[PDB]
């Protein structure tokens, strides 16, 4: 028995899953393309028409599911969309991340792009969770991508409006709904920020390989409203983790105003290569070199540096570098600027530096930059936030978001 | 009136254009989606079957036209694809260009990208012309993109093969058909290069604002076969023109094996920012600083450097720079490396230079590099080709294509 509703065809025996509101998703064909078919019931025909329009308006982007067509029966309405190979959930739940390279982060970056695309179209998803974040089929050359799905609970903000009342009840799924949506009072109407919070938890769900910032399933929602976030899978003294901690912590704040935008999250160091990181260090040092001590830039860079530098950075580096630096007298052990200024000098002159000092630093640029991030795991986080005072400047545009 | 073929609807009174073999294109809609439908007559039903299938294997790429569906009638066959705003022909022939800034080169880079994608899928267009390059309908934010269409005459190379016999006549338009396609004296059958020759003409067509590298319309195909190419639109002593010459002259090469691949074209200086050119001069200089004069790299950089440096480059730079460099007699005016190094030095210590030598150089980075490209209009093209000996080096990966 093969169901043929117009250009869509599927066999009822091939069920890919069950959805809510009696929606059943089969595997089928459309225009000889492999698609997933969704049967919707008359009780939901209206909810399905809005999802298709919001899909038609965004599937162009590579990180949004591709909507194809819709055919109607005397009994059902069928939605044909691009056939994937797995959800992010089964991915986090069943891949050997050790063999998986930097894929997990690029999946997080792609999902973030999709969100910024949707937010550029005044579309809020409201139901972002690892289940409806899909993994594309492997392409002709063997690559996969992440795409956003389940547009049933999406909302297009009204022209000229930048929030949305809580009239659609409490859209979303327990454990991933931001507090404003579930809180009994209405200090302010929700907005795009409810998506970041969901996204923040998802970032952690991937980098923890299964954990949630707000506890286990049954107590999540109650912790979310109570503010009981715990990012335990992230060391406090690891460079990578300290950077992730900064981002995810900002993404799951209780005040949705203090939550970053998706365009900001795309620029975050959490996504930077080592080559880029070292580059950010070089440019900060050059911008501050002739900045006075009374200047705001330098005063923000040095507020709280003693902990960043670990009291005295000269007492925390390798002996071959300590001796090399002792040759002159131009770097203070308490200055985070001078630590960055030292990194600039020892990079420029790297080739004309004694082999013993070259061997402690490592090859450029990856081993060089790691030398200083492992020793001072708060250096990038501290200086990134400090240098925000120069996000308008052309030189720094590659690191912040500032239209 | 309006003809409704299944989910495709159009009005015969809305004709967008006419093709070959009686194929008419109307403006229409598919699934509430503004599309352009194609009416295909019976003698041509098989050409569409191929095009549709090929389109379904590559339409995903942002710069390859998006194909939606295809229905059939009692006597006709219809094909609905993305509706565009113009073709590159109309864009070139009817756009100020003075207020278009750099949009035209972004277009050339986009059609290249889509063509590299098609080649990665073992597909040769074989009929690339400013007519098949359509411009996107403006976005939800006012941006456009170029795309490739007219896949009817495309060729999916046999499995493992990297060439194709001329068994299907000579597909393509008089004026854009590569010479290997028409001649019988050729021993080598055509490959993907045949698409690069055509693109190399379009490249020139766009920068010349309509002109062709092989003359006027009727004598064009005649001139192509004879190798008589003329790019008089490009000055022989202007930095920008020298670069575009180097690339175009290699894409329209008479010998197919001398033509850059699509991925090669994508890295050519023709597409670099001003800052990227500085970064190239800096990396080239830094890389050759500790290289033996007897070394192959140095011997290739100076092979012909006399015309490049215009004899003593110290005598072709502004006087203020001439005085500030007179103290260093290390710089040999007949060395291109010495010129590149003098640039590297002027860039690093730019802030500590006397104001006279700073305002004669210009604001970093754009005006600084222009100081040398305008004065030495062969410096880049000379260095880029000679330094190919280092294309394999990670340092230079941003600048060349290896694998
Ligand atoms: C696109 C798609 C949907 C629709 C998503 C939406 O629009 O909400 C889907 C639903 C279920 Br249940 C089950 C599978 C579904 N699937 C897939 O292709 C797919 C997902 C995981 C593994 C293999 C294939
Ligand atoms: C999508 C599209 C097609 C189909 C391309 C194909 O056959 O692959 C088309 C054909 C002609 Br003729 C003419 C126009 C065509 N057009 C356009 O949107 C368009 C292009 C330029 C100016 C105005 C509209």
Author numbering:
A (entry chain B), B (entry chain A): 562 to 964
Study text:
The obtained structure contained four copies within the asymmetric unit, chain A and chain B formed a back-to-back dimer, and chain C formed the same dimer with chain D from the molecule in the next asymmetric unit. The propionic acid group of IA107 extends towards the pocket proximal to the DFG-motif (Asp-Phe-Gly, residue 711-713), which is a conserved motif located at the beginning region of the kinase activation loop. The N-benzoyl motif of IA107 faces towards the adenine pocket and interacts with the kinase hinge region. Crucial hydrogen bond interactions were formed between the propionic acid of IA107 with the backbone of D711 and with the catalytic K599. Another important hydrogen bond was formed between the carbonyl amide of IA107 and the backbone of C645. IA107 interacts with K599 with the observed N-terminal αC-helix shift upon IA107 binding, and the salt bridge between K599 and E612 of the αC-helix remains intact. The conserved DFG motif does not show any significant shift when aligned with the IA107-binding p-IRE1α structure with the apo form structure, with the DFG-motif adopting a DFG-in conformation in both structures. Despite that the interaction of the two protomers of the kinase domain remains the same, the IA107-binding leads to a more separated conformation between the two RNase domains (835-963) with a reduced overall interaction interface. The kinase domains of the two protomers interact with each other in the back-to-back dimeric conformation upon IA107 binding, maintaining the dimeric and oligomeric assemblies of p-IRE1α but the RNase domains are more separated, resulting in the inhibition of the RNase activity of IRE1α. The binding of IA107 did not impact the formation of the Lys–Glu bridge and the high-order assembly of IRE1α, instead, IA107 inhibited the RNase activity by separating the RNase domain dimer interface, confirming the formation of the RNase dimer is critical for the IRE1 RNase activity.
IRE1α, the most evolutionarily conserved UPR sensor that is ubiquitously expressed, consists of the N-terminal ER luminal domain that senses unfolded proteins and the C-terminal cytoplasmic region that includes the serine/threonine kinase domain and the endoribonuclease (RNase) domain, exhibiting dual kinase and endoribonuclease functions. IRE1α oligomerization and autophosphorylation under ER stress activate its endoribonuclease activity via binding and cleaving RNA substrates, triggering downstream UPR pathways. For example, IRE1α induces splicing of the X-box-binding protein 1 (XBP1) mRNA that encodes the transcription factor XBP1 spliced isoform protein (XBP1), which upregulates genes involved in the ER protein folding and secretion, promotes degradation of misfolded proteins, and further relieves ER stress.
